[PDB]
C-alpha cells in the first residue's frame, strides 16, 4: 500500500542544509537515505554556492543535527552527463535501513509508465503527500531554477518523470512512489523541479546502487 512504503521513505528522509563551519546555515531541501551511510541528493542544492572548498553540509535526522565537510564526503554519479542527482556517502551519520530493494528495477519501468504516483516529501520540516497525474517519461527534460532570489538559469534532467500537480518551494528531494501494487508500489525516483503545473523527477533504479557495496 502507498502508505506502507511511504512510511519507510519517511524514516529515511532528512533535511539538507549548506554553510560554513561555525557560521551561517541555509536549510535548502531534502535528501533521502538509502543504505548504511549513503544518501541521494539533488545537485542544485550545492552547485551554485560560491565556494565548494570551504562548504560544510548539514543534516537534520529527526531532531539531531550532524555535519560533515564537503571535502570528506564521497560522491557518486548515477549516470554520465549533467550532474542532476548524486549519491553521497556521509560517515558521521547514523546507519540507514536498507530500502534499496524497494526502488524500481530497470526492466519494470514500462509497468509504471502512464499511471498515478505520490510524492512523499517534507516542506521546511512538515510532511506532505502530493498527488501526481498519469506519469509520462522524457529522455531529457528542462526546467528553470532561481539562485537564492534573483537570477534564473536553465537546467536539464536526464530520464525524467512528468506529473501534473501544484508544487510548493522546498519540496525537492522527496521520493516518488507508484500506485501500482503489481510492482509493489515501487519508489520511482527523486523530485527535482516544479514549474507551470508540472512536477519533474529523476528516475532512479535498483541498478544505480551496485557500486555502493564495493570496497573502495
Binding site for its own copies (CB under 8 A): 79-80, 106-111, 123-126, 128, 136-140, 149-150, 166-168, 194-197
Which of its own copies, Cl ion, none is residue 196 near (CB under 5 to 8 Å by kind)? Answer: its own copies
Question: Judged by CB, which is closer to Cl ion: 15, or 121?
Answer: 121
Q: Is the separation of the CB atoms in 142 and 154 below 8 Å?
A: yes
User: In the numeric block, which cell numbers belong to residue 75?
Assistant: 560522491
Q: CB under 8 Å to 142, separation ≥6 — which residues?
A: 154, 155, 156, 157
Q: Residue 2 or residue 100: which is nearer to Cl ion going by CB?
A: 2
84 is catalytic: yes
Catalytic residue among 108, 158, 172, 191: 172
Element (H, E) at 160: strand 152-164
Rounded CA separation 190/176 (Å): 6
37, 84, 108, 158: the active-site residue: 84
User: 68: buried, middle or exposed (CB in 10 Å: 19+, 13-18, 0-12)?
Assistant: middle
Is 172 designated active site? Answer: yes
**Residue 131 near Cl ion by CB under 5 A:** no
| 3-state DSSP assignment of residue 140 | strand
**Residues 171 and 130 sit within 8 Å (Cβ to Cβ):** yes
The least CB distance from residue 97 to its own copies, in Å, is 26
Residue 156's binding partner among its own copies, Cl ion, none (Cβ under 5 to 8 angstroms by kind) is none
Q: Check residue 2 for interaction with Cl ion (CB under 5 A).
A: yes
137 binds, among Cl ion, its own copies, none (CB under 5 to 8 A by kind): its own copies
Active site residues: 44, 84, 172
Amino acid at each position: 500500500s502507498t502508505l506502507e512504503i511511504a512510511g519507510l521513505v519517511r524514516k529515511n528522509l532528512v533535511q539538507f542544509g549548506v554553510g560554513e563551519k561555525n557560521g551561517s546555515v541555509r536549510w535548502v531541501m531534502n535528501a533521502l537515505g538509502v543504505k548504511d551511510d549513503w544518501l541521494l541528493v539533488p545537485s542544485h542544492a550545492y552547485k551554485f554556492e560560491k565556494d565548494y572548498e570551504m562548504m560544510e553540509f548539514y543534516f537534520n535526522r529527526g531532531g539531531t543535527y550532524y555535519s560533515i565537510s564537503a571535502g570528506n564526503v564521497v560522491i557518486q554519479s548515477l549516470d554520465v552527463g549533467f550532474q542532476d542527482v548524486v549519491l553521497m556517502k556521509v560517515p558521521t551519520i547514523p546507519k540507514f535501513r536498507d530500502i534499496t530493494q524497494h526502488f524500481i528495477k530497470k526492466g519494470d519501468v514500462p509497468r509504471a509508465l502512464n499511471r498515478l504516483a505520490t510524492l512523499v516529501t517534507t516542506v521546511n520540516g512538515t510532511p506532505m503527500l502530493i498527488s501526481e497525474g498519469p506519469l509520462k517519461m522524457e529522455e531529457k527534460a528542462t526546467y528553470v531554477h532561481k539562485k537564492n532570489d534573483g537570477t534564473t538559469v536553465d537546467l536539464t534532467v536526464d530520464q525524467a518523470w512528468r506529473g501534473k500537480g501544484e508544487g510548493l518551494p522546498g519540496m525537492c528531494g522527496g521520493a516518488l512512489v507508484s500506485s501500482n501494487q503489481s510492482i509493489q508500489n515501487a519508489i520511482l525516483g527523486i523530485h527535482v523541479a516544479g514549474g507551470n503545473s508540472i512536477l519533474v523527477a529523476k528516475l532512479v533504479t535498483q541498478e544505480m546502487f551496485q557500486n555502493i557495496d564495493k570496497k573502495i
